[PDB]
Each structure stands twice: as C-alpha cells, then as structure tokens.
Design an enzyme around this catalytic site. Structure first.
Site, PDB file in Angstrom:
ATOM      1  N   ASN A 286       2.706   7.825   3.175  1.00  0.00           N
ATOM      2  CA  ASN A 286       3.321   6.794   4.012  1.00  0.00           C
ATOM      3  C   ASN A 286       4.846   6.823   3.991  1.00  0.00           C
ATOM      4  O   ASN A 286       5.470   5.909   4.541  1.00  0.00           O
ATOM      5  CB  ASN A 286       2.881   5.392   3.560  1.00  0.00           C
ATOM      6  CG  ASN A 286       1.390   5.258   3.401  1.00  0.00           C
ATOM      7  OD1 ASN A 286       0.922   4.641   2.435  1.00  0.00           O
ATOM      8  ND2 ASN A 286       0.628   5.765   4.367  1.00  0.00           N
TER       9      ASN A 286
ATOM     10  N   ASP B 123       0.826  -1.204   0.000  1.00  0.00           N
ATOM     11  CA  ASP B 123       0.000   0.000   0.000  1.00  0.00           C
ATOM     12  C   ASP B 123       0.860   1.255   0.000  1.00  0.00           C
ATOM     13  O   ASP B 123       0.567   2.228   0.701  1.00  0.00           O
ATOM     14  CB  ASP B 123      -0.951   0.019   1.203  1.00  0.00           C
ATOM     15  CG  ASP B 123      -2.053   1.057   1.055  1.00  0.00           C
ATOM     16  OD1 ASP B 123      -2.262   1.551  -0.075  1.00  0.00           O
ATOM     17  OD2 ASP B 123      -2.674   1.417   2.074  1.00  0.00           O
TER      18      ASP B 123
END
Ligand SMILES: O=C(O)c1cc(OC(F)(F)F)ccc1NCCc1c[nH]c2ccccc12
Length: 281
Positions: free
Chosen positions: A121, A116
């Site tokens: 992130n 992901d």
C-alpha cells in the site's frame, strides 16, 4: 468514461485498475468497490499532503463505489522484492520512514487512521517520494463493502474495539524492520499465530509493561509466557539510533508507543536526506 489499461491489484475490498481518462488523457488508479460515508469520504478530496495518495474523485453510481486516485508506477513491496539481494541503502530507508511518518502525522493530526498499513500500500515514484495509499477506511466510515495480518498491532489482535493512531505506528515499525532486514518481522497466518509470533520476539505482554492488557477482550490467561529476546537479534545491522526508534515504535502499550510527530524528532533522522531510488518501470 475510462479506458482500462491494466489491473493493478485486488484486496478483498475491491479491484484497482490503471485507467486513462478518455477525454483528458490523465492516467489514474481506479478503485471499484462492490457494496454517513459518502460525505466524509468526499471531504478527503481537498485534504492533501505530499506523502498521501491524492483522491481525485468519488463516484457513487449503481450498487458500487468508484474511487479515482492519482497513479504511481511502483510500491514498496515490489521495490523490496527487487532489492532483496542488494538491500535498500540506509539513506533511502531513512528517507522513506521519515516521509511516511510525515504522512501519518498529517492524517493523525486530522484524526484520520490508516488501520491497514502494509508494503504493497506504499507507493513510490522516480523522485524519491513515498505515499500512504489504500487506507482501511471502509469500516470507520461505514461503507457496506486472504487478509494479511503481519502488520497488525497487538491491541487490534487482542480485540480492542477503540484503538488509536498508535496502531499505524506499530504497522510502520514492522515495515521499517522489513526494509532493514529484507524479511517480514511477524509473518503470522492466523490471528493467534500472529499474536504468538509477536510474543515470541517481544515477550508475552503482562500488566507490568502494558497495564490493562489482561482485561482485553481476547486476552487469555492461558497464553504461553515467552521471555522477551534481546532486541539485538531483531534488526541486527541497524545502528542504535535506528534500533532505539524501532523499539519505541513497537512498544506494547499504545500509550507508550511513540507518536508520528515525536518520531520525526528522533535522533535517527538527524542526517536524513532524500535519495532517489533506481526504479525499473
Ligand atoms: O485509500 C482508499 O482506498 C480509501 C478508501 C476510502 O473509503 C472506502 F470506503 F474504504 F472506500 C476512503 C478513503 C480512501 N483513501 C483516502 C486517501 C486520502 C486522501 N486524503 C487524505 C487525508 C487524510 C487521510 C487519508 C487521505
């Protein structure tokens, strides 16, 4: 046990807080997750690399799962927004890509997938470092826990159940393109819109470039057949070394998609350096 300091973010897995250990004063990122996993997760505490966020502690109490991570002040999404009018200098793009490939090669070598990857992130610090964070390990480890699709590999979107390290390379290629151009490459709003944006740019895949694609769970023979547009439109300014590497990162066929380890040897990284970003915290 902690003084909550601010809410860092969300994600439909849980909430993340900046927090200060009441006793030691360490500032950490605290991830609360509402509910074989507990054991294998905890293994990650001692598996560490400079380009992966460190998991300090795992605490299963109540009907929730708390994850204590090292804290970094900035992520690549925020840095990219702050850099939208100027653009990130190529040497820093290159250093970030190199480091992220180092991080992936490490966790792929331990057969751990991220699944992901997205700009928000990817954490960065004042020293020029960038780190993989917010691994999508919930499903893989079996934890009983709006989604961004822009960085999803085509084999995931086509329903592949048993996808590989190649999905992380695809995602990182999309991020690479976004650092270069300051625009998301494939900003889809549904799974089929994501698929069709990919097809409109790279061509509708077929058995010539991706053997077995037509047999995949969500593949439809009725998909429109878009021609591949010339790759010179994709990340225009970038030199041929960069474009070459990107094209291998965005191969349709996961078996042909470059690995993290091989990408580290690509000629694009011959002059790689580690510049320091200018960060406003
Ligand atoms: O990043 C998260 O949020 C997360 C969530 C997890 O499980 C869930 F159930 F989803 F909470 C499990 C691990 C998580 N991070 C792991 C970071 C990490 C440290 N060392 C590593 C070595 C190789 C690959 C990764 C790492």
């Amino acid at each position: 046990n902690f003084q909550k300091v601010e809410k860092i973010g969300e994600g439909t897995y849980g909430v993340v807080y900046k927090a200060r250990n009441k006793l030691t004063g360490e500032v950490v990122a605290l991830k609360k997750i509402r509910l074989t996993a507990i054991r294998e997760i905890s293994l990650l505490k001692e598996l560490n690399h400079p380009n992966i966020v460190k998991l300090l502690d795992v605490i299963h109490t109540e009907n929730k799962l708390y994850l204590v991570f090292e804290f970094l002040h900035q992520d690549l999404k925020k840095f990219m927004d702050a850099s939208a009018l100027t653009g990130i200098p190529l040497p820093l793009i290159k250093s970030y890509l190199f480091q992220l490939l180092q991080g992936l090669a490490f966790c792929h070598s331990h057969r751990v997938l991220h699944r992901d990857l997205k700009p928000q992130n990817l954490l960065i610090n004042t020293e020029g470092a960038i780190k993989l964070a917010d691994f999508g390990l919930a499903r893989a480890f079996g934890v009983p826990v709006v989604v961004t699709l822009w960085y999803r590999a085509p084999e995931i979107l086509l329903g592949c159940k048993y996808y590989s390290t190649a999905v992380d390379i695809w995602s990182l290629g999309c991020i690479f393109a976004e650092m270069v151009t300051r625009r998301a490459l494939f900003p889809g709003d549904s799974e089929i819109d994501q698929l069709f944006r990919i097809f409109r740019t790279l061509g509708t895949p077929d058995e010539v470039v991706w053997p077995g694609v037509t047999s995949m769970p969500d593949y439809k023979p009725s998909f429109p057949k878009w021609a591949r547009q010339d790759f010179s439109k994709v990340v225009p300014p970038l030199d041929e070394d960069g474009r070459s590497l990107l094209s291998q990162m965005l191969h349709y066929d996961p078996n042909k998609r470059i690995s993290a380890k091989a990408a580290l040897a690509h000629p694009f990284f011959q002059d790689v350096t580690k510049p320091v970003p200018h960060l406003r915290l």
